[PDB]
Subunit: 149 residues, 2 copies
C-alpha cells in the first residue's frame, strides 16, 4: 500500500484537472491540462514518480490503460500500470467525494487567481494540509517512512 496511487480526471471551466491520489493517505497531486491525452497523462506520471516512490498506478480509464505513451512512461519510471476497476465499490464513492471536495475548495479560492491552474494548486495545498488529527501530507510521509524502516 505505501506505493499505490490512483488517477482521477475531473472537469472545470472547459478544462481538465488530472489528479493522482495516494490511496492509503488521501494525499493528492494535480494539474490543469487542456484535454486528457496519453502524452499529458504520461508526463504527469513521470513527474509524480520522480517525487514519490510510485509502485503501482491504477489508471483512471481504459484509454489511459491502453495508451502506449502511458505504458512507455510507466515502463520508464518503473511503475506497474494497472486498471482502475472498483472491485471494492467504496473506491468509486471516495473518488467522487474527493472530486466534489476539490471543486468546493477551488470555488472558495477561485477569486484569488486569474488562472484556473493557480486555483487548483491552492486547492491541492489546502487538501493536503487539512487535519482530519493528521493531515494527508503527514500520513503519506509516515506511511512511506515506516515502509523504508
Amino acid at each position: 500500500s505505501p506505493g499505490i496511487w490512483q488517477l482521477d480526471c475531473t472537469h472545470l471551466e472547459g478544462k481538465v484537472i488530472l489528479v493522482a491520489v495516494h490511496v492509503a493517505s488521501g494525499y493528492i497531486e494535480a494539474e490543469v491540462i487542456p484535454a486528457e491525452t496519453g502524452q499529458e497523462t504520461a508526463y504527469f506520471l513521470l513527474k509524480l514518480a520522480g517525487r514519490w516512490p510510485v509502485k503501482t498506478v491504477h489508471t483512471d480509464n481504459g484509454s489511459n490503460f491502453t495508451s502506449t505513451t502511458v505504458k512507455a512512461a510507466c515502463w520508464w519510471a518503473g511503475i506497474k500500470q494497472e486498471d482502475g476497476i472498483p472491485y471494492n465499490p467504496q473506491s468509486q464513492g471516495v473518488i467522487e467525494s474527493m472530486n466534489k471536495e476539490l471543486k468546493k475548495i477551488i470555488g472558495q479560492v477561485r477569486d484569488q487567481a486569474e488562472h484556473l491552474k493557480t486555483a487548483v494548486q491552492m486547492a491541492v495545498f489546502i487538501h493536503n494540509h487539512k487535519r482530519k488529527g493528521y493531515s494527508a501530507g503527514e500520513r503519506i510521509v509516515d506511511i512511506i517512512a515506516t515502509d523504508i524502516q
Copy 2:
C-alpha cells in the same frame, strides 16, 4: 532543517530550469520555464508547498527575493521567504555541483525525449532515486517523518 529549501536557476537549450533543493536531503523538484519571472517563481513555490511542508525558502537571486508576486505566493503558502546569501561558502559549491550533475543526467537521457521538459523530469527522477546507502527521496521522507513524531 526539515522545512528548509533552496531555489536554484540554471540554463540549458535557451531555456531556464528552475530547481528547488531540500537542503538537508538533497532531494529536488524542477521545471522548465521560458524565462525566470516572479510569476513563474511564485507558481513553482505554490506547487512545492502544496506537496512538501515548506517552512523556509532561500531565494535564488535578489529579483525573486524582491518580487511582490513571489512574496504574495510565500505569504499564501505560509513560507518564510529568505535571501540566499551563502554565509556558509560550502552552499555555493554544493549548488554548482548539483547543476553540473543535473546537466550530466539530462545529457544522458536527452535522446529519450523530444522536449527538454521531459528530459528534466527524467533527471529529477534519476537524481532523487540515486543511492549514495540511501537516496535523497528516502532521506527527505525520513527527515520529515522524524520531525512529525
